[PDB]
Amino acid sequence: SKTFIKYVSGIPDYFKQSFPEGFTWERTTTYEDGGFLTAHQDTSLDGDCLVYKVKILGNNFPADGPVMQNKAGRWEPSTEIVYEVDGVLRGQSLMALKCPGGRHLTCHLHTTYRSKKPASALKMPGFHFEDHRIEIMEEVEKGKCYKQYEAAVGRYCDAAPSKLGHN
């Protein structure tokens, strides 16, 4: 849901620029214990309402792992590196599930974001970071119903500045 990002430091917003046409994204998440989760998404704008259509194929999750056992606690916050490749945007991030007991199960996200606008009508952002805070606020049902919050920020590595003037 990349339309909802606070970009700081003048980093161009690839996603907000893509409208009214919108954008797509494609992703494979590789889990450290062998699971793969692949997804494709279309984002469109229907008047005032964003519309997402998602297709998912997941496989190779171990029967005894936290995912198939439904013993995943919560996501840690994560930071994505986002940069231009092949006239589109690539993203990679490391995410970590904080399982009950304290162990983390990690995964590596490989994403390509594709504008429905041609690259020539877009201001591409430079290499930067995108912080994602994803929290399940309530397990309403099972299994069946979840309330999920996200806060996202597009920024540079401000905490450890360059002494050459690089972002």
């Binding site: 606070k6 997941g58 995410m95 099972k142 309330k147 919050y149 996202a152």
Partner: protein, 64 residues
């Protein structure tokens, strides 16, 4: 844009999710609202087929 007074403060969204994980088919619908420029959002996701999920919902988080 001049100032934030001329920007859309909130924008709603709707989602549809269909997939298979470890042989388990499922379908979800979702509804939410967020602040585009503040970068915050919340949504409610409902499993409409294949519920209750026999796997951790967490693996779908980045997809909804």
């Amino acid at each position: 844009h001049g100032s934030a007074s001329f920007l859309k403060k909130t924008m709603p969204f709707k989602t549809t999710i269909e997939g298979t994980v470890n042989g388990h088919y499922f379908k979800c619908t979702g509804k939410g609202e967020g602040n585009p420029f503040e970068g915050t959002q919340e949504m409610k996701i409902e499993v409409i087929e294949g519920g209750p999920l026999p796997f951790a919902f967490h693996i779908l988080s980045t997809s909804c």
